[PDB]
């Protein structure tokens, strides 16, 4: 009926007026390209050959437009159509028509999309206004869209079969609007939380930390290469920190050339203790763990997510606020290029030796787990002989569960702390967690020490069978093993029951991820 | 003759039943192919097992808003002959009635 035509989604109003299918749009898979600027996007030639932009003939561009019309639709750069003052459309793709190829002021030539064009670029879940930013076209071989990796976190995109949409504005006025309003460098700082949206991510952040440590000394040729990869470099080689034994530069000394203008900032590294600020060595930190940038120069400190990441008062945020959008773009690009090219020398990796701990640490972890299990047995025995007193406002079951959860959480935390203390300075898990690039202290704890308790619906594993969890256990067994506490680590491997309990634990997360989206989207639409 | 019944491949009434590797290769049939599907209009169709609640057994559940505090039911079937899927309920009215 007509009611059904107009009523629901894909009905006339919502499906054809509020949103509709559009022309001059392209979609394909996205792949990384660290050699592009933060406002550039790599576009395949086939898409750029199909997509066109109408351009008005003027005495300035008439020669170039005539050359494009002579190239035509066969050769890559030419025109597809010529539009007369009367609106008649001339097609160049089938036949040469040499009498019709004449141009005069007022005609419109629909040329193929070239380097420098402005395009809106979009990823579909479209949650905030940084999900659609204007990019600058660079044409590359193969068939994937290419973008800088700092731009990935605004779009929430990762390079695993992800496709993104490309919209090409077709008029000069709308091109001017996108250029002046929605360009990527103009969207660095979000009005949502007055923080930068783009940051240094992945290889580059870990390489930033390892490069900005004190021990990095750079030889002459390495310095010249790193300076060769600077775009804003003035061309003057700085005097090395060390002169006579051999000329040696430092990572901070080259990072100071990356830092734009005269920026003043003070941050603290992740591994900063609170003892240094109290006693002596306040301004000469022994671990190198306070950050001081004066007059656009890094004097001391190790950079990390707290300095180059997306947080209030970060170095990038201060750079934007002091220097503006144009200089912050070059700041992101220079950091990316020069530090990737330095990481080509040192390299980074992860392996089994990064996840294997000491034999003494293993014994300590096992002793802690045995003590915790004995304590839970003692608590169970106290409840069994009715000696356990119920906590105010709580049932006997509630206080019993609270005590057992307290014991197990304390055990898991202590084992994780021991595992983290056992890590060496060369460990790649630590090198990734400390810099904040990826992973965390709980991930290290679960890899090395103990996977921990498994929970379903915020509770310990229930009794799906009559008075037991699995047919392998005895009825009425409230011990840690029966109720889903995973004693082993991922490196050691899980027993069959712990594996099933971990599968039960992950199923809850998968279900929550699958379910929450509809409600969240419905709330978002109603708010808008 | 009352009709034609599609045959599951490699079943007791399929023409591939009990054939050896040489026979299957002569017939252009892969021995590793398990069968267990149908061929309808040239396409291969696989029946998916459909989960369902058990029958003839008494169950007791508790609905939240329902007039009943407890609802016992028995979805009953006559040995999967003449099947009506008849369900009786035997419910306890909630004491909370004012």
């Amino acid at each position: 009926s007509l009611k059904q035509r107009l009523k629901g989604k894909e009905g006339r109003v919502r499906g054809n007026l509020m949103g509709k299918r559009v022309d001059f749009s392209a979609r394909t898979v996205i792949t990384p390209d660290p050699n592009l600027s933060i406002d550039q996007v790599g576009v395949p030639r086939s898409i750029a050959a199909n997509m066109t932009f109408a351009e008005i003939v003027t005495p300035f561009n008439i020669d170039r437009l005539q050359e494009l019309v002579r190239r035509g639709n066969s050769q890559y750069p030419g025109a597809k159509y010529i539009i007369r003052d009367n609106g008649d459309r001339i097609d160049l793709r089938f036949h040469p028509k040499p009498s019709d190829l004449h141009l005069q002021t007022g005609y419109k030539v629909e040329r193929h999309m070239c380097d420098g064009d402005i395009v809106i670029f979009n990823r579909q879940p479209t949650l905030h206004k940084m999900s659609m930013m204007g990019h600058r076209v660079r044409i590359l071989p193969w068939s994937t869209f290419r973008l800088n990796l700092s731009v990935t976190t605004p779009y929430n995109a990762d390079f695993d079969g992800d496709e993104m949409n490309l919209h090409l504005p077709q008029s000069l006025e709308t091109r001017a609007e996108i250029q002046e309003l929605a360009m990527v460098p103009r969207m660095i700082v979000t009005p949502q939380s007055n923080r930068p949206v783009m940051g240094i991510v992945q290889d580059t952040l870990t390489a930033v930390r390892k490069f900005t440590k004190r021990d990095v000394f750079l030889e002459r040729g390495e310095v010249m290469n790193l300076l060769m990869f600077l775009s804003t470099w003035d061309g003057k080689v700085p005097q090395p920190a060390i002169l006579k034994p051999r000329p040696l530069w430092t990572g901070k000394q080259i990072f100071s050339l990356i830092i734009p203008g005269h920026i003043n900032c003070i941050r603290t590294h992740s591994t900063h203790p609170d003892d240094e600020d109290s006693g002596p060595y306040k301004h000469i930190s022994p671990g190198d763990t306070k950050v001081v940038v004066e007059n656009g120069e890094l004097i001391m400190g190790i950079l990390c997510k707290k300095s180059l990441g997306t947080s209030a008062g970060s170095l990038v945020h201060i750079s934007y606020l002091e220097m503006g959008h144009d200089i912050t773009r070059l700041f992101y690009s220079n950091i990316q290029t020069v530090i990737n090219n330095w990481l080509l020398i040192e390299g980074h990796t992860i392996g089994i030796g990064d996840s294997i701990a000491d034999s003494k640490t293993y014994q300590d972890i096992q002793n802690t787990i045995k003590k915790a299990k004995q304590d839970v047995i003692e608590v169970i025995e106290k409840a069994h002989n009715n000696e356990l007193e119920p906590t105010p406002g709580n049932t006997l079951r509630q206080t019993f569960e609270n005590q057992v959860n307290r014991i197990l959480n304390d055990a898991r935390d202590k084992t994780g702390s021991s595992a983290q203390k056992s890590l060496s300075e060369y460990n790649n898990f630590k090198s990734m967690v400390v810099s904040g690039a990826k992973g965390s202290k709980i991930n290290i704890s679960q890899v090395i020490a103990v996977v921990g308790q498994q929970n379903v619906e915020g509770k310990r594993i229930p009794f799906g069978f009559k008075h037991r969890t699995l047919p392998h256990f005895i009825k009425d067994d409230y011990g840690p093993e029966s109720r889903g506490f995973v004693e082993n680590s991922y490196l050691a491997g899980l027993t069959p029951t712990e594996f099933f309990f971990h599968a039960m634990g992950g199923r809850e997360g998968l279900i929550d991820t699958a379910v929450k989206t509809a409600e969240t989207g419905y709330i978002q639409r109603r708010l808008i | 003759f009352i009709g034609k019944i599609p045959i599951m491949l490699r079943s007791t009434y399929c023409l591939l039943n009990g054939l050896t590797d040489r026979d299957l290769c002569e017939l252009n049939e892969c021995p590793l192919d398990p069968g267990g599907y149908f061929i309808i209009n040239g396409s291969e169709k696989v029946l998916i097992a459909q989960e369902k609640m058990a029958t003839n057994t008494v169950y007791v559940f508790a609905k939240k808003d329902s007039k009943y505090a407890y609802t016992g039911e028995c979805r009953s079937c006559l040995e999967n002959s003449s099947r009506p899927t008849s369900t009786i309920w035997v419910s306890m009215l909630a004491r909370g009635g004012q």
Binding site: - | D21, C25, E26, N28
Partner: protein, 67 residues
């Protein structure tokens, strides 16, 4: 289908060693001894003969669809 001509990693020819490898394994060499006898030192060429599956024998059972 059939043994690749070149090892993918380094480029050594392993296309002429499948029959000899099969013969040695039939002649009671173990896989490790046979690979050493054939002269495949580094793990990239060894995996070629060790993990190969010869489906061309299965494909040759079917009668050709022409004369």
């Amino acid at each position: 289908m059939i043994i690749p001509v070149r090892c993918f990693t380094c480029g050594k020819i392993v296309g002429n060693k499948w029959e000899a490898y099969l013969g040695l394994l039939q002649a009671e060499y173990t896989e490790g001894d046979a690979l050493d006898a054939l002269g495949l030192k580094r793990y990239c060429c060894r995996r070629m003969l060790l993990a190969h599956v010869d489906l061309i024998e299965k494909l040759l059972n079917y009668a050709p669809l022409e004369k």
